[PDB]
Design a protein around this motif. Structure first.
Motif, PDB file in Angstrom:
ATOM      1  N   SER A   1       0.776  -1.276   0.000  1.00 17.00           N
ATOM      2  CA  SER A   1       0.000   0.000   0.000  1.00 17.00           C
ATOM      3  C   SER A   1       0.823   1.353   0.000  1.00 17.00           C
ATOM      4  N   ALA A   2       1.715   1.551   0.987  1.00 17.41           N
ATOM      5  CA  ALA A   2       2.402   2.852   1.249  1.00 17.41           C
ATOM      6  C   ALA A   2       2.571   3.763   0.029  1.00 17.41           C
ATOM      7  N   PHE A   3       2.403   5.076   0.192  1.00 18.61           N
ATOM      8  CA  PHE A   3       2.811   5.967  -0.894  1.00 18.61           C
ATOM      9  C   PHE A   3       4.254   6.508  -0.698  1.00 18.61           C
ATOM     10  N   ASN A   4       5.151   5.530  -0.516  1.00 16.26           N
ATOM     11  CA  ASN A   4       6.569   5.568  -0.869  1.00 16.26           C
ATOM     12  C   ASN A   4       6.740   4.721  -2.152  1.00 16.26           C
ATOM     13  N   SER A   5       6.301   5.242  -3.297  1.00 18.17           N
ATOM     14  CA  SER A   5       6.438   4.550  -4.580  1.00 18.17           C
ATOM     15  C   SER A   5       7.914   4.379  -4.995  1.00 18.17           C
TER      16      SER A   5
END
Length: 304
Positions: A246-250
Motif C-alpha cells: 500500500s504505502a505511498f513511498n512509490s
C-alpha cells in the motif's frame, strides 16, 4: 560538447577498443514496466515511464528484462507476477531498429526468470529463450555470438550482448553464459566470478533498503569502481529500490531522491570509473537537479 548532449549515440564517440566492462553505462531496472497505467499498481510495479526506443534515445544501453514463460515458444515481460503487456520479441525489435539506426552502440540485455511459467509450458525458461529467441533465425545477427569472455565495444557494437540471469545456460556468448551462469545473492552487495572465472562480477542489488541505506550501498560500490582500473572487474550497481504493498513511498519517490544524489556525486568525482548503474525512471528530470543518466554518460574519459 559533453556526450550527454547527444545521448542517442554517445557510444560512437568512444574508443571502441574499450571492453564493455570499463565503459560507464546507464541501465534501466525492469525496463519494460513503462506500459503500466494503473495508479495503485504503479506505486510498486512501475519503474519507467519511457518506452524502449525513448530509453535508448536518452542513452540507456543496459536493459533489465525479466520474463515469464507464456508458452513453449513465448516469453512475456513481467515485474514478478505483474505482466507488462508484451512479449520479448517487442524488446528485440525495438532494439534491432535502434541498433540499425545507431550501429555504433551496443546494448547489453539482462535476462531473468521473474515468475512461474504458464501451466501449459513444458520447457524451461532457459530452453525457451535459447531455442525461440537466441537461436531463432528471426533474430539472426542481432545477438553477440563471439567467444570473447570480455568483449570490447568494437566486437559488440550494433548487437545485443546477453547478460545471463537465467542460471546455467547452454548459450556460449555473453556474461555468465556457461552452464554455471551467475550466482546472484538476494538483496546484497556481492562479488562472484563469472565466465569460467574470466570475470569478477561485483554487484550491489540491495533492493529492499530504505533511502539512506541505499544511497550508502550505491556510493560504497561507486567508491570501489573509482579506484579500480581492472578491465576484468565488472560493476553492476542498482540504484533502484522496492516500494512494497500500500504505502505511498512509490519506486518513483525513492528514485526522485536517489537518482539526483548519486548524480551530484558522480559529477563531483569527475571522470572516474563508475561501472554500470541501473536506475528507475531513466530520463525523468527534476528542475534544479542533476540527471543520473547524463551524469553516467559524461563520466566516460575521452582519450584517443
Amino acid at each position: 560538447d559533453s556526450l550527454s548532449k547527444s545521448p542517442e549515440n554517445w557510444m560512437s564517440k568512444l574508443d571502441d577498443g574499450k571492453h564493455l566492462t570499463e565503459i560507464n553505462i546507464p541501465g534501466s531496472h525492469d525496463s519494460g514496466s513503462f506500459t503500466l497505467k494503473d495508479p495503485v499498481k504503479s506505486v510498486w510495479a512501475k519503474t519507467q515511464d519511457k518506452d524502449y526506443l525513448t530509453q535508448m534515445k536518452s542513452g540507456v544501453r543496459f536493459f533489465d528484462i525479466r520474463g515469464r514463460a507464456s508458452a513453449d515458444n513465448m516469453i512475456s515481460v513481467h515485474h514478478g507476477m505483474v505482466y507488462l503487456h508484451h512479449e520479448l520479441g517487442k524488446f528485440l525489435d525495438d532494439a534491432k531498429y535502434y541498433l540499425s539506426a545507431y550501429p555504433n552502440e551496443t546494448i547489453v540485455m539482462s535476462m531473468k526468470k521473474d515468475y512461474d511459467s504458464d501451466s501449459k509450458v513444458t520447457k524451461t525458461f532457459e530452453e525457451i529463450f535459447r531455442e525461440y529467441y537466441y537461436n531463432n533465425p528471426q533474430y539472426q545477427n542481432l545477438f553477440y555470438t563471439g567467444s570473447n569472455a570480455n568483449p570490447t565495444l568494437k566486437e559488440t557494437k550494433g548487437k545485443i550482448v546477453l547478460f545471463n540471469r537465467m542460471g546455467g545456460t547452454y548459450i556460449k556468448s555473453g556474461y555468465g553464459a556457461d552452464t554455471s551462469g551467475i550466482q546472484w545473492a538476494d538483496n546484497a552487495t556481492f562479488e562472484t566470478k563469472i565466465n569460467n572465472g574470466s570475470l569478477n562480477l561485483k554487484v550491489q542489488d540491495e533492493y529492499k533498503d530504505y533511502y539512506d541505506k541505499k544511497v550508502e550501498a550505491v556510493k560504497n560500490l561507486l567508491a570501489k569502481a573509482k579506484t579500480d582500473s581492472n578491465k576484468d572487474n565488472v560493476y553492476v550497481n542498482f540504484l533502484s529500490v522496492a516500494s512494497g504493498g500500500s504505502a505511498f513511498n512509490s519506486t518513483y519517490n525513492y528514485a526522485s531522491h536517489i537518482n539526483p544524489e548519486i548524480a551530484k556525486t558522480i559529477k563531483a568525482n569527475g571522470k572516474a570509473r563508475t561501472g554500470w548503474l541501473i536506475v528507475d525512471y531513466a530520463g525523468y528530470t527534476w528542475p534544479g537537479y542533476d540527471d543520473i543518466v547524463s551524469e553516467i554518460i559524461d563520466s566516460n574519459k575521452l582519450e584517443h
